[PDB]
Design a protein around this ligand. Structure first.
Ligand SMILES: [K+]
Ligand SMILES: [K+]
Ligand SMILES: [K+]
Ligand SMILES: [K+]
Ligand SMILES: [K+]
Ligand SMILES: [K+]
Ligand SMILES: [K+]
Ligand SMILES: [K+]
Ligand SMILES: [K+]
Ligand SMILES: [K+]
Ligand SMILES: [K+]
Ligand SMILES: [K+]
Ligand SMILES: [K+]
Ligand SMILES: [K+]
Ligand SMILES: [K+]
Ligand SMILES: [K+]
Ligand SMILES: [K+]
Ligand SMILES: [K+]
Ligand SMILES: [K+]
Ligand SMILES: [K+]
Ligand SMILES: [K+]
Ligand SMILES: [K+]
Ligand SMILES: [K+]
Ligand SMILES: [K+]
Ligand SMILES: [K+]
Ligand SMILES: [K+]
Ligand SMILES: [Mg+2]
Ligand SMILES: [Mg+2]
Ligand SMILES: [Mg+2]
Ligand SMILES: [Mg+2]
Ligand SMILES: [Mg+2]
Ligand SMILES: [Mg+2]
Ligand SMILES: [Mg+2]
Ligand SMILES: [Mg+2]
Ligand SMILES: [Mg+2]
Ligand SMILES: [Mg+2]
Ligand SMILES: [Mg+2]
Ligand SMILES: [Mg+2]
Ligand SMILES: [Mg+2]
Ligand SMILES: [Mg+2]
Ligand SMILES: [Mg+2]
Ligand SMILES: [Mg+2]
Ligand SMILES: [Mg+2]
Ligand SMILES: [Mg+2]
Ligand SMILES: [Mg+2]
Ligand SMILES: [Mg+2]
Ligand SMILES: [Mg+2]
Ligand SMILES: [Mg+2]
Ligand SMILES: [Mg+2]
Ligand SMILES: [Mg+2]
Ligand SMILES: [Mg+2]
Ligand SMILES: [Mg+2]
Ligand SMILES: [Mg+2]
Ligand SMILES: [Mg+2]
Ligand SMILES: [Mg+2]
Ligand SMILES: [Mg+2]
Ligand SMILES: [Mg+2]
Ligand SMILES: [Mg+2]
Ligand SMILES: [Mg+2]
Ligand SMILES: [Mg+2]
Ligand SMILES: [Mg+2]
Ligand SMILES: [Mg+2]
Ligand SMILES: [Mg+2]
Ligand SMILES: [Mg+2]
Ligand SMILES: [Mg+2]
Ligand SMILES: [Mg+2]
Ligand SMILES: [Mg+2]
Ligand SMILES: [Mg+2]
Ligand SMILES: [Mg+2]
Ligand SMILES: [Mg+2]
Ligand SMILES: [Mg+2]
Ligand SMILES: [Mg+2]
Ligand SMILES: [Mg+2]
Ligand SMILES: [Mg+2]
Ligand SMILES: [Mg+2]
Ligand SMILES: [Mg+2]
Ligand SMILES: [Mg+2]
Ligand SMILES: [Mg+2]
Ligand SMILES: [Mg+2]
Ligand SMILES: [Mg+2]
Ligand SMILES: [Mg+2]
Ligand SMILES: [Mg+2]
Ligand SMILES: [Mg+2]
Ligand SMILES: [Mg+2]
Ligand SMILES: [Mg+2]
Ligand SMILES: [Mg+2]
Ligand SMILES: [Mg+2]
Ligand SMILES: [Mg+2]
Ligand SMILES: [Mg+2]
Ligand SMILES: [Mg+2]
Ligand SMILES: [Mg+2]
Ligand SMILES: [Mg+2]
Ligand SMILES: [Mg+2]
Ligand SMILES: [Mg+2]
Ligand SMILES: [Mg+2]
Ligand SMILES: [Mg+2]
Ligand SMILES: [Mg+2]
Ligand SMILES: [Mg+2]
Ligand SMILES: [Mg+2]
Ligand SMILES: [Mg+2]
Ligand SMILES: [Mg+2]
Ligand SMILES: [Mg+2]
Ligand SMILES: [Mg+2]
Ligand SMILES: [Mg+2]
Ligand SMILES: [Mg+2]
Ligand SMILES: [Mg+2]
Ligand SMILES: [Mg+2]
Ligand SMILES: [Mg+2]
Ligand SMILES: [Mg+2]
Ligand SMILES: [Mg+2]
Ligand SMILES: [Mg+2]
Ligand SMILES: [Mg+2]
Ligand SMILES: [Mg+2]
Ligand SMILES: [Mg+2]
Ligand SMILES: [Mg+2]
Ligand SMILES: [Mg+2]
Ligand SMILES: [Mg+2]
Ligand SMILES: [Mg+2]
Ligand SMILES: [Mg+2]
Ligand SMILES: [Mg+2]
Ligand SMILES: [Mg+2]
Ligand SMILES: [Mg+2]
Ligand SMILES: [Mg+2]
Ligand SMILES: [Mg+2]
Ligand SMILES: [Mg+2]
Ligand SMILES: [Mg+2]
Length: 248
RNA sequence: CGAGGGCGCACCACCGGCCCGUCUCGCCCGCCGCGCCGGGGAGGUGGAGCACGAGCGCACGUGUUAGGACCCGAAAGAUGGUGAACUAUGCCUGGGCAGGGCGAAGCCAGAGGAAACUCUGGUGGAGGUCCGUAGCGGUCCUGACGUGCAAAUCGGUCGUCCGACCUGGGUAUAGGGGCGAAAGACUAAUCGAACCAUCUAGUAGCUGGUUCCCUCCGAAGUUUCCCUCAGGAUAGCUGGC
RNA sequence: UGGGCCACUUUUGGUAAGCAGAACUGGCGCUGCGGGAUGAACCGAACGCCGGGUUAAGGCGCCCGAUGCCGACGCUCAUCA
RNA sequence: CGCCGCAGGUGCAGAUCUUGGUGGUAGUAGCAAAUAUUCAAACGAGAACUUUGAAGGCCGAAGUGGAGAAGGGUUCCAUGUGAACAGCAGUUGAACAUGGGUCAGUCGGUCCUGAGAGAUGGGCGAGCGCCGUUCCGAAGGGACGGGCGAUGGCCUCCGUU
RNA sequence: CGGUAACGCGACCGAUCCCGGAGAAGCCGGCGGGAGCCCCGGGGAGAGUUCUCUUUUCUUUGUGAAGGGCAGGGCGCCCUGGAAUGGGUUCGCCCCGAGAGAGGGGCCCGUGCCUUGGAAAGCGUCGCGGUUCCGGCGGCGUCCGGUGAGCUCUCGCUGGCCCUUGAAAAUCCGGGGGAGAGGGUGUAAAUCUCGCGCCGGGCCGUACCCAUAUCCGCAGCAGGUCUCCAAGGUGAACAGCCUCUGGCAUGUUGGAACAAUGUAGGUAAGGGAAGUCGGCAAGCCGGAUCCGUAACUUCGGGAUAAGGAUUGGCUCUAAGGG
RNA sequence: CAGGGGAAUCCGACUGUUUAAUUAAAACAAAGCAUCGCGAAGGCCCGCGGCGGGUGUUGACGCGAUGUGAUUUCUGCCCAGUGCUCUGAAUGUCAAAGUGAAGAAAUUCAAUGAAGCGCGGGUAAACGGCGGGAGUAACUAUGACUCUCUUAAGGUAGCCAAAUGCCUCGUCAUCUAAUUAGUGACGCGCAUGAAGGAUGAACGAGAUUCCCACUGUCCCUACCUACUAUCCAGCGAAACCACAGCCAAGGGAACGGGCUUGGCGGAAUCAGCGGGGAAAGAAGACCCUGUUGAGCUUGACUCUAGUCUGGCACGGUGAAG
RNA sequence: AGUUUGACUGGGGCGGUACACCUGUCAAACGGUAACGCAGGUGUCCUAAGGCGAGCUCAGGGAGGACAGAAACCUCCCGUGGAGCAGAAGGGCAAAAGCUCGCUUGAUCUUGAUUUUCAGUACGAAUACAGACCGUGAAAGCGGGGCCUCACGAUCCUUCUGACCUUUUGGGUUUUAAGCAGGAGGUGUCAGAAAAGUUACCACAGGGAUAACUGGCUUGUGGCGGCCAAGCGUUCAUAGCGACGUCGCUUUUUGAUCCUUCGAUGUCGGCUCUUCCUAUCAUUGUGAAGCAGAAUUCACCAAGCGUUGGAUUGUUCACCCACUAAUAGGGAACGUGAGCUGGGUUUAGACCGUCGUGAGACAGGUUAGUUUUACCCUACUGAUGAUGUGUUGUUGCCAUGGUAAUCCUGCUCAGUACGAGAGGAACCGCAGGUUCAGACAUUUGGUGUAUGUGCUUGGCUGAGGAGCCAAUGGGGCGAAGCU
C-alpha cells in the first residue's frame, strides 16, 4: 500500500545525479563548415578526471573560424592521446587516434570512440571507458553505414555521423574487485543515491511485491510481464529466459 | 301496578337487492352513421362500493415515524490546509578526532649462489588494522530510579574510535505522501498512514444515566417469520377510553 | 415483554452434576410477613394505619415468647452417641 | 405573593457526568546524584545561608577558568524595597521599584555565488494558479570611437545635447 | 634606462579585441624553519621561611600596525662547465648529457632581529603633594645568557591514498596586439600604476547570559545544545591523581543520633560454583624489560597465544654528541 | 593507570547498520557470484496537464530491476503446473467502426476478422517440485540383484536427532560419582539438501559445553564505611476513599468487614511489615459477540490509473500494382 | 479503490446440519410438546407405475412328472396375505389398492369454499363441491395424476401462450413498446443479499449471556479402602495375598459443567517461610507371622519430632550419585510476583522445518526481549501509654496465652541369648555425636576509619622535622565492641 523504491526514483528529489563537481558535458564540437568540407586542427591542452565517470576527459582548444577567439571542447579521451598533441576534426582528417571524422569516409574495419547516433548531434555511443564501436559496412547509395555497438548489436546510421578514432581510455576498470563496502560507497557517492540496495524479500509487503512471509521467499514468479504497472514490475522484467546461459 | 299485544332507534347475525371488474349461457332491442356499431338479460365470482350522507376546521392527549430526535460515547470515512526547529535520506558550505601496538609495499647494506635467485640486519610507515582517550553509541547488572533529576535519566561495566567516522549551519523530499544499510523504522513526546479545521451533535441491534407525591390496574421471557440467535415484526399477556 | 429460573410428579441425554432438554401445576422473578439459626424458590400465609381475641406452620431447659404437666408407655450408653 | 386561565429550557444522588469549592490521607511522603565546612567581625529588629577577614577544601587548563555562534530580550549596571517569588531562610537575588547603559570607512551585515529557490517568454490549467529556467522571445537602452549639426558657455577651446 | 642571463630600477602613452593568472581548493604521513608557552644558569626589585639549614623559595623583569635595513627559510630560476673508477643526497626519498658535483648570481616569503614608531606609553618597585575620587609629581629598574624528538600555532619541503580527484561567482591583475593621441626643439605636449598634498566614507547590528540559574525540556529540571585559548609534577599520554593562575561554596534546607530495611563501597577463617535457568554479580589478570610461544590458517594471522623471570632506594661505572 | 586464560560446537565471512522509549541479533548492508531489460522514436520511474520531468553534465567497462551473500569447493534431475518470453502456420474465438442483404424504417441477419486468449517452441542462479510394493546370497541378519505400479522428474554431491527428528531423555562412545546438557559417530531424514549445499582462517557487548585460575554465588553468615531511613526546627504534596475495617463456621452470586450462630471486644499512638482489603494503576490487549473497523494478501466481488490493440479526425502529393 | 468474507453450536474453530421437508419413537392413551435425542428417508421416478373396465390371485410349503439335479417347466393340494403396491417408514388393501389384458389421456379448461402450517398470512400439499369438454364400463359409477402421509419457491426482470382485447400522449394507418390472464427461467441460508483470506502490527463497542487460570457441584477417570472367598501360599481360603463379582471413600489426577469474575482476582517452576492433614517412611508404646536370632512383612494407639547433599532438565514430574533412623504422601486462591527471580509459556525483532498462490499459520524447534506503587485500614512484630486501688514507690501473686527438645553412633552386656552352622541381638550402665533451641566472647577466627601504630606511591607546604590531599590513596599489624 506504499510507493515502492524505484517508483520513488522518478520523482528525482533524493535520487538525482551528483553533478556538483562534474567538469561539463563531454561532447564533440558542433558540426560546421570547416568540419563538413575540410578539417580543423585543435590541440589537446589537458586530460582531466570527471567525477562519477570512469573515463578521462580531454580538453581540446580550437580556433574559431569566424571570429578571433579560442574555442574549448571537452572531448571524451581516446586511449593513447596526450597533452600537446594536435587532433584534427573534419571530413578530410586522416585516420589517427583522437581525430574526429565521419564514419562514411572510413575503412571497413575501423573501430571508433564517440559515435553519433544522428548526423549532427554530438557523440552518443561507445562513451564508457574501454568501449568502442566497429564500422562493418558502408553503402555508397542512401548514405548509410552499419556499425557494431559495444553491446554487440548492429545499427544502421548515416555516413555523416562523426566519431573519434580509437578506444576510449579507462581500460579494464571493472577488472579490479572493489573488495570493501566503503570503496563502493565512495564510487556511488560521486554518482547518485543508489548503492545500499535492500533486497525486496527483506522488506514488508507494504513497500514491495516480494515483501513479507515467515521465510524470506519471493512467493511468486520473479519474471514479470512488460506491461505490468509501476509498483509491480520488479524482479526479472520481460525476461526471455532465466537460469545460467549455457552455450553463448 | 299490570298478563298480554303493537310500532320498533342504534347496533348485531342472516337472507335478498343495486354499482364497477371478470367468466359462463342466451335471446332480444336501437339507428342520419347498419356497423369488426351501440344497448340490454340470467347465473357464479373479484372490489378499500351503494343501500336517505358525516364531514370539514380548530384544540388537547396518546402511539408510530423522518429529522441531532431522551442525554453522553466509538474504531472509522471525506474535504481543505499546516509541519523535515525532532528524526530519515540526498546535496552545499564549515568544524573535529590523546597516547601507544602490529609492521604491507618501496629502499640500503651484509652473506650464500653457475645461474635462477635466496637468507640476515636495518630503513620505511600501509590498513573500512589492534589496545585505548575526546567524541559517537548503548551490552550487562534484567543495578539505581520507577507519584523519578528525567513523560527514557543516572552509576559502574561496555561497542567503536582514519572512517560505510562525528557534528553545526544552509538547502531538497509532505501524508496513502515522503524517507528508510529494512525495525513497519522515522516523518516536532503522535505513525500498520502525522497534525489542524470542517463535513459532525457522523452511526451504534452495544454500555452508562434519565430529576415531585399519593391512588388504581398490572405483566413477559411464549407462537410464527426475519443473514434472525445481545435485535425486530407478529400473536399472546397489560392498561386506558 | 419476547435472556428466565425453581419445586412435587412424569420425563430425554449423561457416571453424575447446584448439568443439559421437555410435560403439568404452583411459585420466585414482581413478595413483604410467621416458621426452617442462617437462605430468591421449602412449610404456613400473601400485606391500607391500629386495639382486642384466636390460630397456621413451627415450637415451649437457657439464649428465646411458651410444659415451672408430680404428662403416659417403652428403646438406647456411644474412648467420632 | 394568593386565586382563575395561559406557556415552558419546570423538580436530581448517581451518568469513570460538567464547572467550582472542600476534606481524610497528613504536619505524612518527602526537601539524600556530583568529598566540606569552621572561627571572628560588620550592617541589621532579626544571620547556618549576606559582606569582609582568617583557616580548611574542591573544580585541576578535555576547568566549576576566560570569550563567542544559535536562542533569550534588558535578564546587563547603580540605588532602594522586602508584599509575593527564589519548594529552609535571607540583611541576598536573574524578584519588585526607580533611574542608567550598546558610539565603527578599516568588527560584521551589506556585495558574490553554492546546493537550491524563482519571475518573464512559452506551455498547461474550469480556476486560484503551476510547469518550466533557456527552454517555442524582435530578450543587448551600453560604449572612450567617427560623422551631421544645435555653440547651450570663461562662444581661443573643452565640456553638454 | 641597466644586466650575458635569471631579472633590476620611482614613474615608464595607448582603446575596442584576445590570451592567461589570482580568487581557486580533499584526506593522511614524515621531516625542517619561525614564533608563543614550558625548562635551566645568572643580575635586579618586591615578598615568603629562618626551631636548624637554605648566596634559598615565589612573583616580576614590554615594544602594535605600517615603512626601511638585515638574518633565516624556499626555488621545477640564470651563467660557466661537462660527469663511469658514476657521483650528489634524504629520516624516507630522490636527482643528473633533457646538464650532476663545484663556483658565481637572481627571485619569492620574510609573522624573526635592528631601526622610525619608542618611552613620552606600559609595568615593577621606593617615596612626595594634593584636585571630596589628579591619564598628579619624582627616584630607580625594565638586564645577560643556555638548552629541546618538549607542547601549541604557523610557514615550507617531500611523499602516500582514491572505480572518491576534493566549489562557483563577484573582484583584482599581468600579458599579446596596436586603432589612436601627443610636440616641433619648447624651459615643450599628450601621458604617468612615482613622492607629497586636499576632500569624503551613508544605513543596520554592537549591553548581558551562552548554561548543574539568563537557551529548549511546564521549573533556578542530574537531560539536551555548535566552537576558540590551555600552566607545573608523575606518566607513553589532551589518562588518572596532586598543585599554580582563575573560579566556587557542595548543587532548592539545617541540627542531633548511628535501630531495622535499603542504596553505594569494602573485608572475611576453611572449602572453592556444592549457589543459580545460567559464574548473574564479584573476584583473578593487568604497565614495562628479558625470555618463550601451540593447533590451525585464506600464510596475512593466531599472538599480549599459552607459560616464566625481573621491577624499590642509594652509590657508582661504561656507551651513545656539538 | 592497567588484557583472566585455554579446549571446542552453532550462526554471521570481516569493518559497518538497525526497532529514539523493553529485542544490537543469527536480523539489514556488504564485496563477490548469477540473472533480467534497454541503442534513445529506448529501458525504468514521476507527472492532473504541456513531446512536461528524473536516471541524464548519462550511452552497454552505462543506467535500470532482481536473487544470493567474502574466499575455497560444488551448485544434480524436472518446462508436466503457474509465470515469463518467441514466430505466427493453412489457422478457432474475438469489440467498436466499416461492408453486404431483408425491411417502410426503427431494426434484424450475414460476411469480414486487432490485440488478447487458445495452438506451437524456449526458459528453473523464474516461482516451485524431486515416488511406492514384493522376492532374493551355503547359519541367521541385511540385500549387491530381480519383478512390477507410477511421475514432469522421482532428492544427486553433501550434511544431520544439526538453530531443521515427532517418536525422543533416539542408539553407541567420550566427558562426571551421578549429565533430559556438551562433543564424536550412526541414519528409511514425522518434515535435510544444493545461489544455495558443504567447508574454512580472522573477527563477534551473538547462542552453547567443558577445563585451569579466581573468588561471599554458596556452606553461613559476620563486621565496617558513606547517604538515607529515624528524632527535631522550617517547609510541605500525591495516589486512593459507598460506609468502614478482629476472627471460626454457616448459608449466600457456590472464597464475608457487615448477615446468622459462636469466639469475643479497652482511649491516643511510634518504628516496621508485606497475610488480607479477591489493594491501586487501565471501560481485559486473551476469548467470544457486533450484520463495528483498520493494516496487509489474493483469479473473492465490483471497479480503476497506466499500458497493448482496432476505428474516426488532424492527414496531404505521386506512381507500381 | 470500494466492499464482502452466512447461521446454528454444552466457548469459538474443525467436524456435522439438528437451516426447507417426510416416517416411527421420544410424547406421559385428544391435539401440541425440546436437546448437535434415537432409527431412517427426500431435491427423484412414472405414457404408465396416470384413468376406467374385465379376468385372475399373491409369499411360502407339501406331493407328483424324460433328460432335470437344491433351484429350468407342467399338475394337484394347503395357503388372512406371512407377497406386491417406484423409493424411507408407518397405515391401508384379496373376485383389492396387487398381477395380466382391452380401450384411453380427469396429468385437460374454469370460479369460488375448505383442510393442513398458521399470525388462523403466504407457498406447497390436500379435501369436498359447482360449471365445461372428455375417457372408460352394459350400467350404477369412477377419473380432473400416482392408495395415504414428503418430493419444493415471492417481488423485480426475462421468455412463451390467449383475447379479430386495452394503451402507445393533436388525429389516422402500420411496425414497435407497454398492459391484462395463465405457464416457465430461482433464490437448498429453501418467507427468497450479489461476496475470498489474513493480522502476533492491530483497533473499537460490548460480553462473565461465552473459553483460557481459582473457587463451587459431579467423580466417569485417577488415587485409597471394604464385603464374598475360586484359588496362591510344599500342605493350608483368609501369616501374607485375592480371581469372578459387588459396596464405598477422597478431591493431591484428568475430565464433565459454565454458577462467580472480561470498567482485569497478575498466568508455570524454583527460592523463602509458616501452619495444617494422615491414608505413618523413621522414631516411642504395642498386637500378628510362613516371628529361632538377625532381617523383613501385616496391623493398632499415634502427626511430638524428623524426612537431607548433589549431576541432567525452565520444568512439575523423572532418573541416577551419595549420605541417612528415614530420605512418606499431601493442603493452605494447583499457599506464597506492591516477597524475589524470569529459566518456561504468552506481544512486537529474527532463523529453520512443515503448511499456504499469498499475506500469514503451527499444544514444532531456536535466539533476544521494561516484572511499576504502601505513607492508608487491619493482621503481625516490636515501642510508648490508657481504665480502677486518693498520690507515689518498693517487693510480689498468678488468670490467661505461648511452650521444646530430637535422633544417632561407639564401648559394655557379648561372639553371649538364639542357631547345625553361617551368623547374631536386647535391658541396665558409660562415652560421645546429629538436628534444633537459648545464650556467650575466656580462648581461636572474622571485622576494623580507635583513622591506633609502622611501611609505602604521586603531589603539596623552600628543605629537615612535622604533616596534609588522592570521595577510606594503598598495604602490614591491631585495642575495644560486635560476631
Ligand atoms: K500508495
Ligand atoms: K530466499
Ligand atoms: K423523536
Ligand atoms: K490546516
Ligand atoms: K494519511
Ligand atoms: K446465541
Ligand atoms: K413485540
Ligand atoms: K580524514
Ligand atoms: K550567543
Ligand atoms: K536515631
Ligand atoms: K555452578
Ligand atoms: K571498526
Ligand atoms: K552488537
Ligand atoms: K534467483
Ligand atoms: K515447468
Ligand atoms: K513452463
Ligand atoms: K555481537
Ligand atoms: K492499522
Ligand atoms: K404421543
Ligand atoms: K435465510
Ligand atoms: K472416583
Ligand atoms: K475436579
Ligand atoms: K468458569
Ligand atoms: K475476566
Ligand atoms: K530448585
Ligand atoms: K583480629
Ligand atoms: Mg542488498
Ligand atoms: Mg523485517
Ligand atoms: Mg503488495
Ligand atoms: Mg514477500
Ligand atoms: Mg535466505
Ligand atoms: Mg346480503
Ligand atoms: Mg398507532
Ligand atoms: Mg468506508
Ligand atoms: Mg527547515
Ligand atoms: Mg535539520
Ligand atoms: Mg579500526
Ligand atoms: Mg578497535
Ligand atoms: Mg548505561
Ligand atoms: Mg532495572
Ligand atoms: Mg446525542
Ligand atoms: Mg460522536
Ligand atoms: Mg433472508
Ligand atoms: Mg446487556
Ligand atoms: Mg434481551
Ligand atoms: Mg428465548
Ligand atoms: Mg434445567
Ligand atoms: Mg427481571
Ligand atoms: Mg404475580
Ligand atoms: Mg411471598
Ligand atoms: Mg422468616
Ligand atoms: Mg437449618
Ligand atoms: Mg426455637
Ligand atoms: Mg421463657
Ligand atoms: Mg431541562
Ligand atoms: Mg447533584
Ligand atoms: Mg518526614
Ligand atoms: Mg530527606
Ligand atoms: Mg584537586
Ligand atoms: Mg566558560
Ligand atoms: Mg545583576
Ligand atoms: Mg522559601
Ligand atoms: Mg524585573
Ligand atoms: Mg621595538
Ligand atoms: Mg649544480
Ligand atoms: Mg618609564
Ligand atoms: Mg604591448
Ligand atoms: Mg559584548
Ligand atoms: Mg540543567
Ligand atoms: Mg514550551
Ligand atoms: Mg555532600
Ligand atoms: Mg549547603
Ligand atoms: Mg541548581
Ligand atoms: Mg573466604
Ligand atoms: Mg581462603
Ligand atoms: Mg550446580
Ligand atoms: Mg542446586
Ligand atoms: Mg560479569
Ligand atoms: Mg588461542
Ligand atoms: Mg557480522
Ligand atoms: Mg561466506
Ligand atoms: Mg543505533
Ligand atoms: Mg529499543
Ligand atoms: Mg537494548
Ligand atoms: Mg560465495
Ligand atoms: Mg549484490
Ligand atoms: Mg532445463
Ligand atoms: Mg540422501
Ligand atoms: Mg536428521
Ligand atoms: Mg550430535
Ligand atoms: Mg553443567
Ligand atoms: Mg538447482
Ligand atoms: Mg471470616
Ligand atoms: Mg469487603
Ligand atoms: Mg470491556
Ligand atoms: Mg479496552
Ligand atoms: Mg446478528
Ligand atoms: Mg473494512
Ligand atoms: Mg477472480
Ligand atoms: Mg456463529
Ligand atoms: Mg398426554
Ligand atoms: Mg397424545
Ligand atoms: Mg377389478
Ligand atoms: Mg427462511
Ligand atoms: Mg513485523
Ligand atoms: Mg456464567
Ligand atoms: Mg492351595
Ligand atoms: Mg473487579
Ligand atoms: Mg488489581
Ligand atoms: Mg490481588
Ligand atoms: Mg491413623
Ligand atoms: Mg498458586
Ligand atoms: Mg513482580
Ligand atoms: Mg502476594
Ligand atoms: Mg525469557
Ligand atoms: Mg517474538
Ligand atoms: Mg536442537
Ligand atoms: Mg539483549
Ligand atoms: Mg516515615
Ligand atoms: Mg499454660
Ligand atoms: Mg513444637
Ligand atoms: Mg609521598
Ligand atoms: Mg620529611
Ligand atoms: Mg587541596
Ligand atoms: Mg578528587
Ligand atoms: Mg587484620
Amino acid at each position: 500500500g506504499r510507493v515502492i523504491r524505484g517508483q520513488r526514483k522518478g520523482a528525482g528529489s533524493v535520487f538525482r545525479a551528483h553533478v556538483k563537481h562534474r567538469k561539463g558535458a563531454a561532447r564533440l564540437r558542433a558540426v560546421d563548415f570547416a568540419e563538413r568540407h575540410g578539417y580543423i586542427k585543435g590541440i589537446v591542452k589537458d586530460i582531466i578526471h570527471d567525477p562519477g565517470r570512469g573515463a578521462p576527459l580531454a580538453k581540446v582548444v580550437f580556433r574559431d573560424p569566424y571570429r578571433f577567439k579560442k574555442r574549448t571542447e571537452l572531448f571524451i579521451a581516446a586511449e593513447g592521446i596526450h597533452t600537446g598533441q594536435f587532433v584534427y576534426c573534419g571530413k578530410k582528417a586522416q585516420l589517427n587516434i583522437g581525430n574526429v571524422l565521419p564514419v562514411g569516409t572510413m575503412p571497413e574495419g575501423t573501430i571508433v570512440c564517440c559515435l553519433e547516433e544522428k548526423p549532427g548531434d554530438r557523440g552518443k555511443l561507445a562513451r564508457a571507458s574501454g568501449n568502442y564501436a566497429t564500422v562493418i559496412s558502408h553503402n555508397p547509395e542512401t548514405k548509410k553505414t552499419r556499425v557494431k555497438l559495444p553491446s554487440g548489436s548492429k545499427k544502421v546510421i548515416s555516413s555523416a555521423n562523426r566519431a573519434v578514432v580509437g578506444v576510449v581510455a579507462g581500460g579494464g576498470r571493472i577488472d579490479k574487485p572493489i573488495l570493501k563496502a566503503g570503496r563502493a560507497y565512495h564510487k556511488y557517492k560521486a554518482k547518485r543515491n543508489c548503492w545500499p540496495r535492500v533486497r525486496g524479500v527483506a522488506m514488508n509487503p507494504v513497500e514491495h511485491p516480494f515483501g513479507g512471509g515467515n521465510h524470506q521467499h519471493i512467493g511468486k514468479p520473479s519474471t514479470i510481464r512488460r506491461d505490468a504497472p509501476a509498483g509491480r514490475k520488479v524482479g526479472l522484467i520481460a525476461a526471455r529466459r532465466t537460469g545460467r546461459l549455457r552455450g553463448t
